[PDB]
Design a protein around this ligand. Structure first.
Ligand SMILES: [Mg+2]
Ligand SMILES: [Mg+2]
Ligand SMILES: [Mg+2]
Ligand SMILES: [Mg+2]
Ligand SMILES: [Mg+2]
Ligand SMILES: [Mg+2]
Ligand SMILES: [Mg+2]
Ligand SMILES: [Mg+2]
Ligand SMILES: [Mg+2]
Ligand SMILES: [Mg+2]
Ligand SMILES: [Mg+2]
Ligand SMILES: [Mg+2]
Ligand SMILES: [Mg+2]
Ligand SMILES: [Mg+2]
Ligand SMILES: [Mg+2]
Ligand SMILES: [Mg+2]
Ligand SMILES: [Mg+2]
Ligand SMILES: [Mg+2]
Ligand SMILES: [Mg+2]
Ligand SMILES: [Mg+2]
Ligand SMILES: [Mg+2]
Ligand SMILES: [Mg+2]
Ligand SMILES: [Mg+2]
Ligand SMILES: [Mg+2]
Ligand SMILES: [Mg+2]
Ligand SMILES: [Mg+2]
Ligand SMILES: [Mg+2]
Ligand SMILES: [Mg+2]
Ligand SMILES: [Mg+2]
Ligand SMILES: [Mg+2]
Ligand SMILES: [Mg+2]
Ligand SMILES: [Mg+2]
Ligand SMILES: [Mg+2]
Ligand SMILES: [Mg+2]
Ligand SMILES: [Zn+2]
Lengths: 60, 206, 24, 78, 70, 155
RNA sequence: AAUUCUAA
RNA sequence: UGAAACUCAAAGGAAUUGACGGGGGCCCGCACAAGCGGUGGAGCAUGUGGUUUAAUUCGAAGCAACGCGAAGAACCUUACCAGGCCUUGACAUGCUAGGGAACCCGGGUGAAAGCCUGGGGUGCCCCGCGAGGGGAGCCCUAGCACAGGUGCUGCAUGGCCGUCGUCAGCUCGUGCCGUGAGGUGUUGGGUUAAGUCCCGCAACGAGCGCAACCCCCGCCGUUAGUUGCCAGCGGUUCGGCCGGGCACUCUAACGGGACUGCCCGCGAAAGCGGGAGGAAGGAGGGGACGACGUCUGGUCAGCAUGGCCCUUACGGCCUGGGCGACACACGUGCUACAAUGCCCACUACAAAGCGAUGCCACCCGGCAACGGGGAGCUAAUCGCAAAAAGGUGGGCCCAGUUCGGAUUGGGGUCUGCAACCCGACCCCAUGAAGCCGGAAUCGCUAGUAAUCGCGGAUCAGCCAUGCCGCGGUGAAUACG
């Protein structure tokens, strides 16, 4: 119900209402920023590697 | 479970990004995804070179793919047959012009991602981990450096009692920003658990 | 009070507009 | 609540409708508890799916704007 | 399975659990179903009532006798 | 407050009378940090003063606030299985706070429906050594002295 | 002037 | 005076290192005391136990689980159940055969899935105009190797994380004492936020830590002008509207500035008290960062992976129900119990963000939600937009009331295939409990607590009173 699931987040069958986000690195379905397209985990793990454009840990 | 990445912590200053290219909130997503799909294919067929980094620049509708390595060879072949079929495979799934490149690393022992895969491999090849660590560090500090540090997660030697063998030499202030410390991390994959290794190489400063 | 859906703060705290709070 | 229409599922009417010509039997299964009972249905019982099975829910005048799903409880011992 | 229950007795105790629990259950062909589940059952799980939380064992018996002469 | 002897935050002089105390009293009438709708009330009272006593609202203060200063109150301690609530002197600083506080509290009790009225009235009766606020003064002073049995216990 | 915490 | 049977694999001496003490010495933290506002009571929202149920998916469990995963459950999401279907299959890879090799609009049937089915025709390798089929894409069905699993194990594991703890610590090399475990260093004397520094000393240095480098708020200047500006005159429909002008404001980029440097008092030093200059002193206010390790902590359900396990189903698909259940009990919360107040109208002042099937100027119909029209905007130059408390003059006049908005009847708008379960606002009518909260218990030492409102992530919509930020007003008190 994981792989066979992301394999439907890709398509847009009947109605648009069933159109829902989904992380890209993994199949994360919750907490996914339409912007980056990554979950909150992947997002953090990457920003650490530096593989995230213009992104950097804030501080104020 | 503390300590945070020493890279995303230096991003601001010390360390540069690893994929710099301004972008609009309408593109950033698809493009950022591109860099990954690229770092992904270059991950496999290139592992024999030691892809110790992959900086990717882009002005627009182009790509500055640069595979820095301490040992090119297999990257090119002996003229331009290999390194050519890779520029081939790249844009062979990227609607843009994959401008490929290949740099060199003088001292591979002073490269984290490398020393990482190093020990990470002596592991899958059943080696005295207590040694591989004290030896790999005995490679850096010796081959010119100021600090060294290796770490291996649980399942060492195969013992069901998942340990975590330390071992470091020199200096490694992950708290000090003005220092620049190279970090690496590879994953040995054995019959039992799935060990993990961390590399810490201290270099310059100010 | 901030729950009287038929008043001033009624809509303020609510974030809507109605007969009891037309848009200016 | 809808304002322009009556969101009654296709198979709902299409079936019932022809069933009105000469007044067919009655046993009419369904899975559209999420539809509506427009007038003219009076008399025709429907086998609504409470999620588990078909409930022989009778239809009468009074109950109109109400839906089919609003006649087949879905939990027990409320 | 339908059968009904009658808690003849039930008493707690000191730290945690239950000291003695006796019950009467009816419903067609009942004893025949619980007669088999007669003996001492063992359990292995992390003892909550421990500091280290070590893996611990526990024994408790289940007797089964039908309501006959009254 | 185990290290520093803390610090006595400073009260900025009034913006009408120029009194660093005429404010400390307003501060106590301040609910939700609303000093405007608070100091206002106070000021609507000073007019309740000059209108029920030629007395200018200043000594109606230096008097009601002076007739409330408890000379000595009680601060409990425990030597060990000792339910001794020792009586003892009051910090000149503390005195004022207890005063002003009790003045407001008392005020907020009177049956006067408005507000300034209460403060105004309570200020007069307290000035007149007979306000609900002084009741708290003697009441507090009763406990003290009445237990001078524990004079060797002023921690 | 204040009890107790089984046994991997 | 003085046994034995039986029984255990130790009983024990000293000395280590720790942990512990209702031992002691010194010193800290909103720990207490000092003081202000809450919870516990009521109604409701929400998370949990319980019970219930066809199912009410699962995990989290003192602190450190309970507005937690969940930064968006009507079908989706979804892991649960009932029912209808599908098997190399929703996806990867290689391969097999006659098919077949881009391929396109439907018909029928059913709840949908699905089963079935009615037509266009394949650039081309090109012996070759041709029959043909080599033919690259590469879809159709059978067959093979395999796929698939939020099924189990967080005591098989990685990574990431919580926590003691931003605590002042934990260690190393060599030497010296010790038979040894280990000790000295790191104790002691003075000091600080600190294993901070100083002073001694069988010790001498060194590493991980603190500190410092980094960012934000402060003051100042350099560069920069479509933000702003009669600062100066100008014309000004009198709105920086306009030419005009970088002076302000300000925007964002690089610097400067504070160091116990100076004076006075103590002192062996370190450093403390205190003086002036200054926007700022003795880490200037907040962030960033969190050691050796601890809790067989958390996480196989984000993911990765060892081992076990189901593989025409422990897989896959759809319709529908469920996660929203309710005699109860607990946690976090919202709004109240009114006059420092509530209602009505008028008039003001922010910040940080945010916008292409997006934010909507202004009109218009509508009591209104909202709905027709429509300009601006790729956005310091247009929109969200009005901030609210306040200022203000006026209606209530102490009453369950003009306090309170729960419940419920009737009628609507918006997103969406569709709001019965189970959505959000709108309006009319209902106007419940609560008159300040038992034993207990929580937070906060300053632009803090209290109180007020705005924006953002998620996202069709939204159950958001939640979470992450911002600024308006602005305290009380610290003896110890
Ligand atoms: Mg969604
Ligand atoms: Mg129903
Ligand atoms: Mg007993
Ligand atoms: Mg006992
Ligand atoms: Mg014990
Ligand atoms: Mg013997
Ligand atoms: Mg001994
Ligand atoms: Mg005692
Ligand atoms: Mg206290
Ligand atoms: Mg309550
Ligand atoms: Mg599980
Ligand atoms: Mg907690
Ligand atoms: Mg939600
Ligand atoms: Mg659903
Ligand atoms: Mg599902
Ligand atoms: Mg399942
Ligand atoms: Mg664990
Ligand atoms: Mg300690
Ligand atoms: Mg020692
Ligand atoms: Mg040090
Ligand atoms: Mg020393
Ligand atoms: Mg000092
Ligand atoms: Mg555990
Ligand atoms: Mg657990
Ligand atoms: Mg897994
Ligand atoms: Mg996965
Ligand atoms: Mg079967
Ligand atoms: Mg549901
Ligand atoms: Mg739930
Ligand atoms: Mg348009
Ligand atoms: Mg306007
Ligand atoms: Mg109150
Ligand atoms: Mg504090
Ligand atoms: Mg004070
Ligand atoms: Zn993800």
């Amino acid at each position: 119900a994981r792989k066979a699931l992301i394999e439907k987040a890709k398509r847009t069958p009947k109605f648009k209402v069933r159109a829902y986000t989904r992380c890209v690195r993994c199949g994360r379905a919750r907490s996914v920023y339409r912007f980056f397209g990554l979950c909150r985990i992947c997002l953090r793990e990457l920003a650490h590697k530096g593989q995230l454009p213009g992104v950097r840990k804030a501080s104020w | 479970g503390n300590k945070i990445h020493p890279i995303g912590f230096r991003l601001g200053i010390t360390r540069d990004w690893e994929s710099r290219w301004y972008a609009g909130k309408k593109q950033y997503r698809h493009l950022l995804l591109e860099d990954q799909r690229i770092r992904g294919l270059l991950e496999k067929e290139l592992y024999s070179a030691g892809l110790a980094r992959v900086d990717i620049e882009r002005a627009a509708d182009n790509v500055a793919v640069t595979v820095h390595v301490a040992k090119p060879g297999v990257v090119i072949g002996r003229g331009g047959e290999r390194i050519r079929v890779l520029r081939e495979e790249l844009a062979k799934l990227t609607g843009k012009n994959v401008a490929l490149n290949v740099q060199e690393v003088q001292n591979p022992n002073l490269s984290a991602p490398l020393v990482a895969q190093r020990v990470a491999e002596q592991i899958e090849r059943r080696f005295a981990v207590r040694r591989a660590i004290k030896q790999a560090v005995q490679r850096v500090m010796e081959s010119g450096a100021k600090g060294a540090k290796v770490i291996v997660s649980g399942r060492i030697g195969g013992a069901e009692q998942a340990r975590t063998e330390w071992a470091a030499q020199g200096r490694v202030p992950l708290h000090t920003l003005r220092a620049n410390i190279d970090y690496g991390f590879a994953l040995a994959r054995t019959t039992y658990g799935v060990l993990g290794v961390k590399a810490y190489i201290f270099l310059g400063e100010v | 009070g901030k729950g009287d859906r038929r008043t001033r703060r009624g809509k303020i705290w609510r974030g809507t507009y109605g007969k009891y709070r037309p848009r200016k | 609540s809808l304002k322009k229409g009556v969101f009654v599922d296709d198979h709902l009417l299409e079936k019932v409708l022809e069933l009105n010509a000469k007044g067919e039997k009655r046993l009419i299964k369904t899975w559209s508890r999420r539809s509506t009972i427009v007038p003219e249905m009076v008399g025709h019982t429907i086998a609504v799916y409470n999620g588990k099975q078909h409930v022989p829910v009778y239809i009468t005048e009074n109950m109109v704007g109400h839906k089919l799903g609003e006649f087949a409880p879905t939990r027990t011992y409320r | 399975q339908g059968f009904q229950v009658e808690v003849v007795d039930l008493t707690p105790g000191p730290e945690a659990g239950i000291d003695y629990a006796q019950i009467l259950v009816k419903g067609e062909n009942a004893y025949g179903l619980l007669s088999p589940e007669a003996g001492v059952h063992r359990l292995v799980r992390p003892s909550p009532f421990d500091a280290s939380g070590r893996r611990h064992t526990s024994f408790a018996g289940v007797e089964v006798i039908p309501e006959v002469d009254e | 407050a185990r290290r520093r002897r803390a610090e006595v935050r400073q009260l900025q002089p009034d913006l009408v009378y120029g009194d660093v105390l005429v404010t400390a009293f307003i501060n106590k009438i301040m609910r939700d940090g609303k000093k405007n709708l608070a100091a206002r009330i106070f000021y609507d009272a000073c007019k309740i003063i000059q209108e029920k006593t030629g007395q200018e609202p200043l000594k109606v203060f230096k008097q009601a606030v002076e007739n409330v200063k408890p000379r000595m109150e009680v601060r409990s301690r425990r030597v060990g299985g000792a339910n001794y609530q020792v009586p003892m002197e009051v910090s000149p600083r503390r005195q004022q706070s207890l005063a002003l506080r009790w003045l407001v509290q008392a005020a907020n009790q009177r049956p006067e429906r408005r507000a300034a009225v209460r403060i105004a009235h309570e200020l007069m009766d307290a000035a007149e050594g007979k306000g609900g606020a002084v009741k708290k003064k003697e009441d507090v002073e009763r406990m003290a002295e009445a237990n001078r049995a524990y004079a060797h216990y002023r921690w």
